Design a protein around this ligand. Structure first.
Ligand SMILES: [Mg+2]
Ligand SMILES: [Mg+2]
Ligand SMILES: [Mg+2]
Ligand SMILES: [Mg+2]
Ligand SMILES: [Mg+2]
Ligand SMILES: [Mg+2]
Ligand SMILES: [Mg+2]
Ligand SMILES: [Mg+2]
Ligand SMILES: [Mg+2]
Ligand SMILES: [Mg+2]
Ligand SMILES: [Mg+2]
Ligand SMILES: [Mg+2]
Ligand SMILES: [Mg+2]
Ligand SMILES: [Mg+2]
Ligand SMILES: [Mg+2]
Ligand SMILES: [Mg+2]
Ligand SMILES: [Mg+2]
Ligand SMILES: [Mg+2]
Ligand SMILES: [Mg+2]
Ligand SMILES: [Mg+2]
Ligand SMILES: [Mg+2]
Ligand SMILES: [Mg+2]
Ligand SMILES: [Mg+2]
Ligand SMILES: [Mg+2]
Ligand SMILES: [Mg+2]
Ligand SMILES: [Mg+2]
Ligand SMILES: [Mg+2]
Ligand SMILES: [Mg+2]
Ligand SMILES: [Mg+2]
Ligand SMILES: [Mg+2]
Ligand SMILES: [Mg+2]
Ligand SMILES: [Mg+2]
Ligand SMILES: [Mg+2]
Ligand SMILES: [Mg+2]
Ligand SMILES: [Mg+2]
Ligand SMILES: [Mg+2]
Ligand SMILES: [Mg+2]
Ligand SMILES: [Mg+2]
Ligand SMILES: [Mg+2]
Ligand SMILES: [Mg+2]
Ligand SMILES: [Mg+2]
Ligand SMILES: [Mg+2]
Ligand SMILES: [Mg+2]
Ligand SMILES: [Mg+2]
Ligand SMILES: [Mg+2]
Ligand SMILES: [Mg+2]
Ligand SMILES: [Mg+2]
Ligand SMILES: [Mg+2]
Ligand SMILES: [Mg+2]
Ligand SMILES: [Mg+2]
Ligand SMILES: [Mg+2]
Ligand SMILES: [Mg+2]
Ligand SMILES: [Mg+2]
Ligand SMILES: [Mg+2]
Ligand SMILES: [Mg+2]
Ligand SMILES: [Mg+2]
Ligand SMILES: [Mg+2]
Ligand SMILES: [Mg+2]
Ligand SMILES: [Mg+2]
Ligand SMILES: [Mg+2]
Ligand SMILES: [Mg+2]
Ligand SMILES: [Mg+2]
Ligand SMILES: [Mg+2]
Ligand SMILES: [Mg+2]
Ligand SMILES: [Mg+2]
Ligand SMILES: [Mg+2]
Ligand SMILES: [Mg+2]
Ligand SMILES: [Mg+2]
Ligand SMILES: [Mg+2]
Ligand SMILES: [Mg+2]
Ligand SMILES: [Mg+2]
Ligand SMILES: [Mg+2]
Ligand SMILES: [Mg+2]
Ligand SMILES: [Mg+2]
Ligand SMILES: [Mg+2]
Ligand SMILES: [Mg+2]
Ligand SMILES: [Mg+2]
Ligand SMILES: [Mg+2]
Ligand SMILES: [Mg+2]
Ligand SMILES: [Mg+2]
Ligand SMILES: [Mg+2]
Ligand SMILES: [Mg+2]
Ligand SMILES: [Mg+2]
Ligand SMILES: [Mg+2]
Ligand SMILES: [Mg+2]
Ligand SMILES: [Mg+2]
Ligand SMILES: [Mg+2]
Ligand SMILES: [Mg+2]
Ligand SMILES: [Mg+2]
Ligand SMILES: [Mg+2]
Ligand SMILES: [Mg+2]
Ligand SMILES: [Mg+2]
Ligand SMILES: [Mg+2]
Ligand SMILES: [Mg+2]
Ligand SMILES: [Mg+2]
Ligand SMILES: [Mg+2]
Ligand SMILES: [Mg+2]
Ligand SMILES: [Mg+2]
Ligand SMILES: [Mg+2]
Ligand SMILES: [Mg+2]
Ligand SMILES: [Mg+2]
Ligand SMILES: [Mg+2]
Ligand SMILES: [Mg+2]
Ligand SMILES: [Mg+2]
Ligand SMILES: [Mg+2]
Ligand SMILES: [Mg+2]
Ligand SMILES: [Mg+2]
Ligand SMILES: [Mg+2]
Ligand SMILES: [Mg+2]
Ligand SMILES: [Mg+2]
Ligand SMILES: [Mg+2]
Ligand SMILES: [Mg+2]
Ligand SMILES: [Mg+2]
Ligand SMILES: [Mg+2]
Ligand SMILES: [Mg+2]
Ligand SMILES: [Mg+2]
Ligand SMILES: [Mg+2]
Ligand SMILES: [Mg+2]
Ligand SMILES: [Mg+2]
Ligand SMILES: [Mg+2]
Ligand SMILES: [Mg+2]
Ligand SMILES: [Mg+2]
Ligand SMILES: [Mg+2]
Ligand SMILES: [Mg+2]
Ligand SMILES: [Mg+2]
Ligand SMILES: [Mg+2]
Ligand SMILES: [Mg+2]
Ligand SMILES: [Mg+2]
Ligand SMILES: [Mg+2]
Ligand SMILES: [Mg+2]
Ligand SMILES: [Mg+2]
Ligand SMILES: [Mg+2]
Ligand SMILES: [Mg+2]
Ligand SMILES: [Mg+2]
Ligand SMILES: [Mg+2]
Ligand SMILES: [Mg+2]
Ligand SMILES: [Mg+2]
Ligand SMILES: [Mg+2]
Ligand SMILES: [Mg+2]
Ligand SMILES: [Mg+2]
Ligand SMILES: [Mg+2]
Ligand SMILES: [Mg+2]
Ligand SMILES: [Mg+2]
Ligand SMILES: [Mg+2]
Ligand SMILES: [Mg+2]
Ligand SMILES: [Mg+2]
Ligand SMILES: [Mg+2]
Ligand SMILES: [Mg+2]
Ligand SMILES: [Mg+2]
Ligand SMILES: [Mg+2]
Ligand SMILES: [Mg+2]
Ligand SMILES: [Mg+2]
Ligand SMILES: [Mg+2]
Ligand SMILES: [Mg+2]
Ligand SMILES: [Mg+2]
Ligand SMILES: [Mg+2]
Ligand SMILES: [Mg+2]
Ligand SMILES: [Mg+2]
Ligand SMILES: [Mg+2]
Ligand SMILES: [Mg+2]
Ligand SMILES: [Mg+2]
Ligand SMILES: [Mg+2]
Ligand SMILES: [Mg+2]
Ligand SMILES: [Mg+2]
Ligand SMILES: [Mg+2]
Ligand SMILES: [Mg+2]
Ligand SMILES: [Mg+2]
Ligand SMILES: [Mg+2]
Ligand SMILES: [Mg+2]
Ligand SMILES: [Mg+2]
Ligand SMILES: [Mg+2]
Length: 51
RNA sequence: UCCAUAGGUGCAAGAGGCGAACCAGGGGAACUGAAACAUCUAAGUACCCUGAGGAAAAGAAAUCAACCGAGAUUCCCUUA
RNA sequence: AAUGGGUCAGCGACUUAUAUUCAGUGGCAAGCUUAACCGUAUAGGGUAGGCGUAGCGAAAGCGAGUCUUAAUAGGGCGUU
RNA sequence: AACCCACUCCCGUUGAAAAGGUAGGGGAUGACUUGUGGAUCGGAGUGAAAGGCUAAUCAAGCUCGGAGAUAGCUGGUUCUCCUCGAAAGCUAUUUAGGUAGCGCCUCAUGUAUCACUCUGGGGGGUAGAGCACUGUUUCGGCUAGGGGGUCAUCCCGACUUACCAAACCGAUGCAAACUCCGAAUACCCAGAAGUGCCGAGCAUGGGAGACACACGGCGGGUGCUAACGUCCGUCGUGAAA
RNA sequence: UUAAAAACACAGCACUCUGCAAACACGAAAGUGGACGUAUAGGGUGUGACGCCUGCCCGGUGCCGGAAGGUUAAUUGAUGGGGUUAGCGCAAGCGAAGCUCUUGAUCGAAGCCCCGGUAAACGGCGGCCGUAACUAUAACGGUCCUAAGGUAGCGAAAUUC
RNA sequence: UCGCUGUGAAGAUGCAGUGUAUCCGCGGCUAGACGGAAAGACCCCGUGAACCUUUACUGUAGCUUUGCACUGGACUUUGAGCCUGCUUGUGUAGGAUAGGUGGGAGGCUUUGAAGCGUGGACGCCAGUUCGCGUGGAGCCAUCCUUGAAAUACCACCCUGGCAUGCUUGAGGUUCUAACUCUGGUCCGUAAUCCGGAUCGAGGACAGUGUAUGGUGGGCAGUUUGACUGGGGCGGUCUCCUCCUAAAGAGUAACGGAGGAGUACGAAGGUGCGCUCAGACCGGUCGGAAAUCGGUCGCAGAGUAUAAAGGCAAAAGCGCGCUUGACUGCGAGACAGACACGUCGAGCAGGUACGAAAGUAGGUCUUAGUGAUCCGGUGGUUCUGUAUGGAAGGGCCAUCGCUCAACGGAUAAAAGGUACUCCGGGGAUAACAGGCUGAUACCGCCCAAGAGUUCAUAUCGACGGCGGUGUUUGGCACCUCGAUGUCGGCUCAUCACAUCCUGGGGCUGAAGCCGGUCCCAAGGGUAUGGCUGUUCGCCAUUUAAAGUGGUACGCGAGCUGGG
RNA sequence: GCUUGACGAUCAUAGAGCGUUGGAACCACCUGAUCCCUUCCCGAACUCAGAAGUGAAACGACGCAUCGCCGAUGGUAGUGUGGGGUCUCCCCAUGUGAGAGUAGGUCAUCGUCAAGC
């Protein structure tokens, strides 16, 4: 099925977003830009683990 | 069993039993409640047993406080 | 043709204590009221304590404001 | 025979008797019967075993305490008058004969809306109807073709449609889960006259009860368009007249 | 005190435990019974004179034996990770020793897993296709499954719709 | 304190209509007063009770394993540590030797006794240490070159293991002195108890305390859902779509039909661009259907997934860029018992596509879900029990539940009761009564046909219409503070849809016998074998061995076989 | 007012089909692919530079009801309220009133601006 993952901001903040992904069809990591409330810009967010 | 130990008799003093409650200890339930029931509660209650007294118990900080201080134990009213 | 009563006389079922909330009726009034306890013992003392006069926030805290928030924007709660 | 037992019938059943009697019946020197004294008992005793017996009490004796155990369950609840006056529904529940919030009753305070009718706006997809879609039905025609035959062609041209025939044309029915259509009523909204028992509406508090409904009419499902059957909607009555 | 029997007991049979301070039972324990007995004895279990007999299955569950190897308790405390602070540092922050909070290496028996026995231990003991000079049925062949597929005797029976 | 027929919480002495009837005893019989007696024992219910079972849950007595204590000496085997000279150092390569550093450039203890070997050797083996057979004798030439670091040198750590020392894990043997003896003989003592003494035996075992693993219905406290045309068995329990649903919303049934417990980093955003299915004609292998060209076509295609409602600014299809599947909010509404749920303009921050107006807070919409408690992870100008910190707590973000009985009792749970018990219920079953009449039974309508011919002497297919309450059922209105249920005996009473006897019509009625229909209820209407039987089958009779109602008549009349 | 373009109003009485007609301007076809821009290939479509030719096609205007679409009057069905019957269904009084069909209509009607007279 789809497994819960965690997107950690590339800035120094500890802010993160949560989503799910199909780890069988798409094994490679996600590199997406999302708004970071602490620093107040859009920055690269990188996939990590939820556990 | 050699010494002396156990043991055996004779005297003196004391104890033993009863009593409704109160006190200090030893042992210690279940119904019930949780709208079921195991942790929990009822409750260290009911009950059983042992000591003491007119009361008993506890009592004179290896105690609390908070950088200011208080000043043995027991009981009552608050903090609640 | 469901229950109860053979009849009479007597007895027989919403109570009390402590904490509270609302209403009525009184005393004081930005204040009201004492508890244990003293006592000349229903008086008088005793204002420790309780409620009210300010709220918001989980809190530090700030205060007619405060919380959320980057925001004196909006919004929640509160204020003559 | 005595003595110990208890197989059968009848009587008795408010008995002479809370287990007997008259007739018959079994054992009767033995694993026999019996007197006196003694031992084992309450989750314990004893039992040639029936869950039997332990003082007329036994799938756990009696008695006194915990104790006024707990009882969403039955029963009962005592003088008088006046005003108002229900519900048997929704939701949830280890819930279904209990309880909780809401709907319905009553009292108090505050506040300004409410009902009926007329006029004017609005949406709908039901009754009815229809076949334009989806299905389903009958008749006639016209057929593409399967080819029934088939001259019978090594097997091809086809002789020809005496069987079948999609599709198309016309006529003709049906539908809770079909619709090219489409009411009456009922629902919202606004503006107005009068009536309202002097109020109707709304909000906030004090107290509840009730959450087993019944029949009759109308609209339906279920049943057999059977039931004083059962389950819904909407009125009326009973409940409480 | 509604059931006297086909129910219980029984003599006989079998299995199993027990070497004596016996197994076992009643007792918080002392002790007592077993028994002032001693394996021809004592306890438990099933069957139930006598006659003829008592077939197959150790896969499950139990019991007995084995001990190699896997797991496996309290116990032990290697290692790693933090808390405090003498000292250094402008600060930020680093920081020895002590005490302290965690982590858990190593050690560790029976048991269980494993291996083998045992049914008068608790238990279990089948199907489907063809095949004979009329028909019918298969002495005979295949084939699936199992731990193994009910023997001798008896049978509309205290069992048979 | 009458009968009958109706009515009626549905079987009336008491109600309605009607008929009978002076008032009161005694002896008898039991049909009724749903007669008396026992708050139904059968059935269901209660978040009731007892006792029993087990591979239900959780425990526990007993039995057993190991650590520590009581508990000691010696010897031996055996693993680790520590102490010790640290000798022991032999690969391409260096005569020879490669674990390294500091003093050091040569080594003059009998130099380094030199040339081979000699006993003990080891050995990445032909190399090295230790006595040169002779004897106090000059070779290893220090980079002599090579070798990654050169010997000889004096200190500092380590390595293959020897010899011991000091511990300490495990095993075996042995001893006596702890402990044990329900063994002997002496004493207390007049004593099979018990002590003390002494012989004998066992012996640091056994046993007991404490800690811990295994086993353990021997014993204990409990659990084991609800709905339900009675309970049980079966099925269901949360969410979405349609009908039922009566043209606003909502609306039940163990009513009729289907789906869900997901998917997608592009299947999202944006800008630009474009229209399907199908048919026919023509065209190489395919030929009905591949790709192609033309005409018609208007959505009969498509939409990630059920159905319904939608879809041209297409919401369908393709391409380029991209991350708005953004953070803080949020006027106002829809729904609604609550807890939850749904839509959303607009403002502030930063973005993405477009020239721009602009669009973007996921997907055409409606299913794809689980509260609180507890525990974990990332942050935090909060708190932090004398103080400074820390532990812990609070706040924000986020993980772990077929808790599917889906508003989820507990972290943790199955059965039997005919040995049963209590509180209740005709709120709910079995018997009888009531309603109904599908079924049952009895009539009638039509007439294909059978009857040699001939529809109706006698029958009668396919179909239709009634009657009676009379079987099997449906319902659950009465009775659970009790209305005794099959069959037999005794005694009955009524109906007529008549079995015999009586009177008739037709006949496929010669007579004697029959068949069928109409009228008729006065009187009659077997005995046995089997079986508990009603019934049925048999045997033998009779004029005939009728069918039904009466609580399937009759237990305060008998019986007790079922 | 007459003709042509662009944008609207309204969505078939406005559509479809058949036929006649329009080039002075406007529009359309048209020439070429050098330059911007383009084809998952093609200047086919989009785009650019135009002025030789035509009104063939497309578009517009005008006629025709064959089809499509509208559609009365009257009657019928259903239905709110009150009352009846022989009550699974109907009738009466009062108010309301379809769908289908029939007679019959339809080859639209407007607004703003710019160009030719
Ligand atoms: Mg005394
Ligand atoms: Mg308890
Ligand atoms: Mg309880
Ligand atoms: Mg309770
Ligand atoms: Mg209980
Ligand atoms: Mg307690
Ligand atoms: Mg105690
Ligand atoms: Mg005294
Ligand atoms: Mg003292
Ligand atoms: Mg003190
Ligand atoms: Mg001081
Ligand atoms: Mg003092
Ligand atoms: Mg009466
Ligand atoms: Mg009764
Ligand atoms: Mg009752
Ligand atoms: Mg009564
Ligand atoms: Mg009575
Ligand atoms: Mg006042
Ligand atoms: Mg504010
Ligand atoms: Mg405010
Ligand atoms: Mg006698
Ligand atoms: Mg006799
Ligand atoms: Mg006798
Ligand atoms: Mg006799
Ligand atoms: Mg005899
Ligand atoms: Mg005797
Ligand atoms: Mg006794
Ligand atoms: Mg007892
Ligand atoms: Mg029994
Ligand atoms: Mg007694
Ligand atoms: Mg007795
Ligand atoms: Mg109590
Ligand atoms: Mg009581
Ligand atoms: Mg009652
Ligand atoms: Mg009134
Ligand atoms: Mg719900
Ligand atoms: Mg109840
Ligand atoms: Mg109220
Ligand atoms: Mg209809
Ligand atoms: Mg149709
Ligand atoms: Mg046809
Ligand atoms: Mg319809
Ligand atoms: Mg008035
Ligand atoms: Mg209820
Ligand atoms: Mg309620
Ligand atoms: Mg109800
Ligand atoms: Mg009901
Ligand atoms: Mg109802
Ligand atoms: Mg009703
Ligand atoms: Mg009806
Ligand atoms: Mg109905
Ligand atoms: Mg009815
Ligand atoms: Mg009813
Ligand atoms: Mg009704
Ligand atoms: Mg009503
Ligand atoms: Mg009324
Ligand atoms: Mg009532
Ligand atoms: Mg009346
Ligand atoms: Mg006998
Ligand atoms: Mg007897
Ligand atoms: Mg017996
Ligand atoms: Mg034996
Ligand atoms: Mg036997
Ligand atoms: Mg036998
Ligand atoms: Mg084996
Ligand atoms: Mg075995
Ligand atoms: Mg073994
Ligand atoms: Mg440290
Ligand atoms: Mg190990
Ligand atoms: Mg082991
Ligand atoms: Mg064997
Ligand atoms: Mg056997
Ligand atoms: Mg045989
Ligand atoms: Mg047989
Ligand atoms: Mg026989
Ligand atoms: Mg059998
Ligand atoms: Mg009379
Ligand atoms: Mg009646
Ligand atoms: Mg009657
Ligand atoms: Mg009367
Ligand atoms: Mg009367
Ligand atoms: Mg009357
Ligand atoms: Mg009499
Ligand atoms: Mg009599
Ligand atoms: Mg009588
Ligand atoms: Mg009675
Ligand atoms: Mg009672
Ligand atoms: Mg009862
Ligand atoms: Mg029972
Ligand atoms: Mg329950
Ligand atoms: Mg309950
Ligand atoms: Mg002994
Ligand atoms: Mg002795
Ligand atoms: Mg000795
Ligand atoms: Mg030992
Ligand atoms: Mg030991
Ligand atoms: Mg021990
Ligand atoms: Mg031990
Ligand atoms: Mg048990
Ligand atoms: Mg038990
Ligand atoms: Mg257990
Ligand atoms: Mg037990
Ligand atoms: Mg209990
Ligand atoms: Mg229980
Ligand atoms: Mg439970
Ligand atoms: Mg139930
Ligand atoms: Mg049922
Ligand atoms: Mg029923
Ligand atoms: Mg079930
Ligand atoms: Mg509706
Ligand atoms: Mg409606
Ligand atoms: Mg309802
Ligand atoms: Mg489903
Ligand atoms: Mg899409
Ligand atoms: Mg659709
Ligand atoms: Mg478009
Ligand atoms: Mg609303
Ligand atoms: Mg831009
Ligand atoms: Mg912009
Ligand atoms: Mg919990
Ligand atoms: Mg501190
Ligand atoms: Mg903290
Ligand atoms: Mg539930
Ligand atoms: Mg639920
Ligand atoms: Mg629950
Ligand atoms: Mg039970
Ligand atoms: Mg009872
Ligand atoms: Mg009862
Ligand atoms: Mg009933
Ligand atoms: Mg019920
Ligand atoms: Mg009866
Ligand atoms: Mg009945
Ligand atoms: Mg009938
Ligand atoms: Mg014939
Ligand atoms: Mg009838
Ligand atoms: Mg009857
Ligand atoms: Mg009912
Ligand atoms: Mg009755
Ligand atoms: Mg009853
Ligand atoms: Mg009664
Ligand atoms: Mg009776
Ligand atoms: Mg008779
Ligand atoms: Mg009669
Ligand atoms: Mg007759
Ligand atoms: Mg007849
Ligand atoms: Mg007759
Ligand atoms: Mg006759
Ligand atoms: Mg005749
Ligand atoms: Mg007759
Ligand atoms: Mg007769
Ligand atoms: Mg007669
Ligand atoms: Mg007569
Ligand atoms: Mg006569
Ligand atoms: Mg007879
Ligand atoms: Mg007979
Ligand atoms: Mg018989
Ligand atoms: Mg009769
Ligand atoms: Mg009758
Ligand atoms: Mg009958
Ligand atoms: Mg009867
Ligand atoms: Mg009869
Ligand atoms: Mg009788
Ligand atoms: Mg009888
Ligand atoms: Mg009798
Ligand atoms: Mg009677
Ligand atoms: Mg009698
Ligand atoms: Mg009997
Ligand atoms: Mg008998
Ligand atoms: Mg009209
Ligand atoms: Mg019309
Ligand atoms: Mg029309």
């Amino acid at each position: 099925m789809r497994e819960l993952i965690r997107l950690v901001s590339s800035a120094g903040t500890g802010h993160f977003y949560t989503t799910d992904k199909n780890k069988r069809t798409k094994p490679e990591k996600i590199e997406i830009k999302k708004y970071d409330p602490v620093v107040r810009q859009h920055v690269i967010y990188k996939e990590a683990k939820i556990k």
